[PDB]
Amino acid sequence: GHSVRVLQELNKQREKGQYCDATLDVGGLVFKAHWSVLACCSHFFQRIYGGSVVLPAGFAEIFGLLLDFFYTGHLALTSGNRDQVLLAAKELRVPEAVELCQSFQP
Amino acid sequence: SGHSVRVLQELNKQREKGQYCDATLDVGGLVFKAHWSVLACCSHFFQRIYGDGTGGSVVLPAGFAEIFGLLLDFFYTGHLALTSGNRDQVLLAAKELRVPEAVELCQSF
């Protein structure tokens, strides 16, 4: 379980903003994260990497879910947020997330 | 396996190409690219270097060069190629670099 422990330590790290070279502003919510983790699950983040990134405010409601998924592998889906998460996952080029939303069975 | 396995393998792949790596480890001449975030999870020695100032490149003494890659492979994979011929130069480096999990194995065998 070495990799499980490392990722939850990374997750704990970003909650505290530690070692986080990436700060994301969506709506009015600011999020700390690691570019390296973001690049693992998102083609959009891979592409805009080259300080401070602003994302569409219409994602604020579900951005935390999307990010938790990156650090934990669990996308907090619901019949009520499914279409929102899907739209955000497509735009942010998060392959695994689109698959999860499309296959989602309430 | 699982989600964490896949993410760490990607970060491993990343550093093996110097992508999204914010750390440069210069050990006696051979450099290793890595992620501070991951370095911090396994050793407080790296936590201190990161905070207690060190500009950019981290310069360690050439003594580890030999085994360093192994110790670093362990960070990104959870497995240290503990050979009967390195078991000692690996353990000494683990205690030196302050990597608790690494020493434990060196001892186990």
From Swiss-Prot, chain A:
Residues 20-79 form the BTB domain. This is Zinc finger and BTB domain-containing protein 48. It is found in: Nucleus; Chromosome, Telomere. The chain holds residues 8 to 116 of 681 of the full protein. Belongs to the krueppel C2H2-type zinc-finger protein family. Interacts with EP300. Plays a critical role in transcriptional regulation and chromatin remodeling. Acts as a regulator of telomere length. Directly binds the telomeric double-stranded 5'-TTAGGG-3' repeat. Preferentially binds to telomeres that have a low concentration of shelterin complex and acts as a regulator of telomere length by initiating telomere trimming, a process that prevents the accumulation of aberrantly long telomeres. Also acts as a transcription regulator that binds to promoter regions. Regulates expression of a small subset of genes, including MTFP1. The lineage of its organism: Eukaryota, Metazoa, Chordata, Craniata, Vertebrata. It comes from Mus musculus (Mouse). Coiled coil: none annotated. Disruption phenotype: Deficient mice are born at Mendelian ratios and do not display any obvious growth defects. However, the percentage of MHC-II-positive B cells is reduced in Zbtb48-deficient mice. The gene is Zbtb48. The C2H2-type zinc fingers mediate binding to the telomeric double-stranded 5'-TTAGGG-3' repeats. The last C2H2-type zinc finger is required for telomeric-binding. The two last C2H2-type zinc fingers are required for CIITA promoter III binding.
From Swiss-Prot, chain B:
Disruption phenotype: Deficient mice are born at Mendelian ratios and do not display any obvious growth defects. However, the percentage of MHC-II-positive B cells is reduced in Zbtb48-deficient mice. Residues 21-84 form the BTB domain. Signal peptide: none annotated. It is found in: Nucleus; Chromosome, Telomere. The C2H2-type zinc fingers mediate binding to the telomeric double-stranded 5'-TTAGGG-3' repeats. The last C2H2-type zinc finger is required for telomeric-binding. The two last C2H2-type zinc fingers are required for CIITA promoter III binding. Plays a critical role in transcriptional regulation and chromatin remodeling. Acts as a regulator of telomere length. Directly binds the telomeric double-stranded 5'-TTAGGG-3' repeat. Preferentially binds to telomeres that have a low concentration of shelterin complex and acts as a regulator of telomere length by initiating telomere trimming, a process that prevents the accumulation of aberrantly long telomeres. Also acts as a transcription regulator that binds to promoter regions. Regulates expression of a small subset of genes, including MTFP1. Belongs to the krueppel C2H2-type zinc-finger protein family. This is Zinc finger and BTB domain-containing protein 48. It comes from Mus musculus (Mouse). The gene is Zbtb48. The chain holds residues 8 to 114 of 681 of the full protein.
